[PDB]
Amino acid sequence: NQALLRILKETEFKKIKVLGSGAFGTVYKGLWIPEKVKIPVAIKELREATSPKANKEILDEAYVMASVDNPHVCRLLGICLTSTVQLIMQLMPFGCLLDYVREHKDNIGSQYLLNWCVQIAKGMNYLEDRRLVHRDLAARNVLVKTPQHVKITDFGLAKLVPIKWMALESILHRIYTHQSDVWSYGVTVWELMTFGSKPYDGIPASEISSILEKGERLPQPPICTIDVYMIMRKCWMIDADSRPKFRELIIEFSKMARDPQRYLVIQ
Ligand SMILES: *CCC(=O)Nc1cccc(-c2c[nH]c3ncnc(Nc4ccc5c(cnn5Cc5ccccc5)c4)c23)c1
């Protein structure tokens, strides 16, 4: 447990380039130099002094993030606690899956798409087995190591509001469970099947709850056969217990991945 998370000194890593920024902070492409080696790594520097969280509480959450052991979930490699929290992770050179599918839309076939739905469902099922709720699953929070190998990221970062990815019960009661992660998974699948479309495009965040109450859901992507769409639709049921479990999401999308042209119709 304790040895799974490395406490990095400031001299062990060097920020080289910027990869992205937001309210959370900044991510850098970096070099980890512990030993005559140089490891390409990504370094997320969180915004300083957002909350009064103590160092012991931070490392306790980082230990959990360093303990994940699944091919489709990102693992925290190291942490550097200074004025800011700096999280060190291996570099995913193809970026987030949302930007990937938007840039490669013309060259993405049915096997790649269903293989992604399988891998995301496997990573989420592992998080649920670890009794961990993600709370922020979206195509922007899936990283691409190689085109056929993706990993879920940004779990547990909430500890220390994406309305359009949240289940109705999370919007109305701030309830977050593994079945509310299933809702976000269905939206994530919708993002992939539309090659990176924005869900409820133009609709303001304050109107999403009434849209869902009216029974409106994200429209069937053109390439999705009715089989794929009803699985996505089942993820968006009001009754969280009636939504699919991640375990059975792995099964059906695995079955569909055996014959992808039967379930996705791509030009
Ligand atoms: C979809 C648009 C987008 O997100 N672009 C983007 C922005 C910032 C960084 C990256 C990016 C590109 N390649 C990457 N490789 C590896 N990591 C990141 N970003 C990233 C995400 C999350 C993260 C870190 C570092 N620490 N965390 C949090 C974390 C890590 C492990 C486990 C749990 C939580 C870097 C990359 C793309």
PDB file of C-alpha atoms in Angstrom, residues 72 96-99 101-102 112-122 124 134-144 150-153 162-167 180-200 218-219 221 223-224 228 231-233 235-236 246 249 253 264:
ATOM      1  CA  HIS A  72      -8.384   0.557 -18.136  1.00  0.00           C
ATOM      2  CA  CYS A  96      -8.235  12.541 -24.251  1.00  0.00           C
ATOM      3  CA  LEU A  97     -10.598  10.258 -26.149  1.00  0.00           C
ATOM      4  CA  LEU A  98     -13.020  13.127 -26.894  1.00  0.00           C
ATOM      5  CA  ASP A  99     -10.415  15.076 -28.867  1.00  0.00           C
ATOM      6  CA  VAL A 101     -12.548  10.842 -31.967  1.00  0.00           C
ATOM      7  CA  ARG A 102     -13.193  14.413 -33.130  1.00  0.00           C
ATOM      8  CA  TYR A 112     -12.663   0.652 -32.496  1.00  0.00           C
ATOM      9  CA  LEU A 113     -15.862   2.189 -31.114  1.00  0.00           C
ATOM     10  CA  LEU A 114     -17.222  -0.974 -29.499  1.00  0.00           C
ATOM     11  CA  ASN A 115     -13.761  -1.877 -28.189  1.00  0.00           C
ATOM     12  CA  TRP A 116     -13.740   1.503 -26.448  1.00  0.00           C
ATOM     13  CA  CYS A 117     -17.164   0.907 -24.885  1.00  0.00           C
ATOM     14  CA  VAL A 118     -15.906  -2.445 -23.578  1.00  0.00           C
ATOM     15  CA  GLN A 119     -12.715  -1.007 -22.069  1.00  0.00           C
ATOM     16  CA  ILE A 120     -14.496   1.910 -20.415  1.00  0.00           C
ATOM     17  CA  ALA A 121     -17.057  -0.493 -18.949  1.00  0.00           C
ATOM     18  CA  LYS A 122     -14.250  -2.731 -17.639  1.00  0.00           C
ATOM     19  CA  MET A 124     -15.780   1.321 -14.328  1.00  0.00           C
ATOM     20  CA  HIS A 134     -16.222   8.195 -10.182  1.00  0.00           C
ATOM     21  CA  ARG A 135     -18.725  11.093 -10.258  1.00  0.00           C
ATOM     22  CA  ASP A 136     -17.226  12.566 -13.448  1.00  0.00           C
ATOM     23  CA  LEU A 137     -17.175   9.953 -16.215  1.00  0.00           C
ATOM     24  CA  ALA A 138     -17.098  11.576 -19.663  1.00  0.00           C
ATOM     25  CA  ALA A 139     -15.209  11.230 -22.932  1.00  0.00           C
ATOM     26  CA  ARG A 140     -12.947  14.088 -21.814  1.00  0.00           C
ATOM     27  CA  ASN A 141     -11.909  12.003 -18.772  1.00  0.00           C
ATOM     28  CA  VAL A 142     -10.877   8.951 -20.812  1.00  0.00           C
ATOM     29  CA  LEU A 143      -7.252   9.013 -21.978  1.00  0.00           C
ATOM     30  CA  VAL A 144      -5.760   7.198 -24.966  1.00  0.00           C
ATOM     31  CA  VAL A 150      -7.875   3.645 -23.221  1.00  0.00           C
ATOM     32  CA  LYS A 151      -7.944   4.402 -19.497  1.00  0.00           C
ATOM     33  CA  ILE A 152     -10.337   6.251 -17.206  1.00  0.00           C
ATOM     34  CA  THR A 153      -8.821   9.190 -15.324  1.00  0.00           C
ATOM     35  CA  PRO A 162     -21.048  18.530 -15.339  1.00  0.00           C
ATOM     36  CA  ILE A 163     -24.841  18.730 -15.484  1.00  0.00           C
ATOM     37  CA  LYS A 164     -25.087  17.195 -18.954  1.00  0.00           C
ATOM     38  CA  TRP A 165     -23.424  13.947 -17.788  1.00  0.00           C
ATOM     39  CA  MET A 166     -25.229  13.587 -14.441  1.00  0.00           C
ATOM     40  CA  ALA A 167     -28.167  11.357 -13.593  1.00  0.00           C
ATOM     41  CA  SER A 180     -25.370   7.259 -11.402  1.00  0.00           C
ATOM     42  CA  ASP A 181     -22.016   6.415 -13.005  1.00  0.00           C
ATOM     43  CA  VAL A 182     -23.981   4.169 -15.392  1.00  0.00           C
ATOM     44  CA  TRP A 183     -25.916   7.232 -16.565  1.00  0.00           C
ATOM     45  CA  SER A 184     -22.654   9.077 -17.251  1.00  0.00           C
ATOM     46  CA  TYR A 185     -21.379   5.992 -19.079  1.00  0.00           C
ATOM     47  CA  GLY A 186     -24.398   6.080 -21.386  1.00  0.00           C
ATOM     48  CA  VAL A 187     -23.688   9.726 -22.183  1.00  0.00           C
ATOM     49  CA  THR A 188     -20.030   8.835 -22.732  1.00  0.00           C
ATOM     50  CA  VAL A 189     -21.078   6.153 -25.222  1.00  0.00           C
ATOM     51  CA  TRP A 190     -23.294   8.734 -26.924  1.00  0.00           C
ATOM     52  CA  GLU A 191     -20.295  11.065 -27.275  1.00  0.00           C
ATOM     53  CA  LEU A 192     -18.303   8.302 -28.988  1.00  0.00           C
ATOM     54  CA  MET A 193     -21.083   7.186 -31.330  1.00  0.00           C
ATOM     55  CA  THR A 194     -21.576  10.787 -32.495  1.00  0.00           C
ATOM     56  CA  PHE A 195     -17.799  11.241 -32.965  1.00  0.00           C
ATOM     57  CA  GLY A 196     -17.598  13.879 -30.254  1.00  0.00           C
ATOM     58  CA  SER A 197     -20.865  15.797 -30.445  1.00  0.00           C
ATOM     59  CA  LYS A 198     -21.805  17.937 -27.467  1.00  0.00           C
ATOM     60  CA  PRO A 199     -24.783  16.489 -25.553  1.00  0.00           C
ATOM     61  CA  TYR A 200     -27.844  18.766 -25.444  1.00  0.00           C
ATOM     62  CA  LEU A 218     -30.110  12.254 -26.217  1.00  0.00           C
ATOM     63  CA  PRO A 219     -31.135  11.295 -29.766  1.00  0.00           C
ATOM     64  CA  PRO A 221     -26.851   8.467 -33.229  1.00  0.00           C
ATOM     65  CA  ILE A 223     -24.674   4.831 -36.867  1.00  0.00           C
ATOM     66  CA  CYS A 224     -26.295   3.090 -33.871  1.00  0.00           C
ATOM     67  CA  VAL A 228     -27.032  -0.255 -29.267  1.00  0.00           C
ATOM     68  CA  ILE A 231     -28.698  -0.033 -24.067  1.00  0.00           C
ATOM     69  CA  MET A 232     -27.820   3.669 -23.952  1.00  0.00           C
ATOM     70  CA  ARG A 233     -31.481   4.484 -23.310  1.00  0.00           C
ATOM     71  CA  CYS A 235     -28.656   3.801 -18.843  1.00  0.00           C
ATOM     72  CA  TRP A 236     -30.866   6.927 -18.678  1.00  0.00           C
ATOM     73  CA  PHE A 246     -21.340  -2.317 -15.495  1.00  0.00           C
ATOM     74  CA  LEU A 249     -22.487  -3.702 -19.943  1.00  0.00           C
ATOM     75  CA  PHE A 253     -20.710  -4.712 -25.658  1.00  0.00           C
ATOM     76  CA  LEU A 264     -22.867  -0.081 -35.943  1.00  0.00           C
TER      77      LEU A 264
END
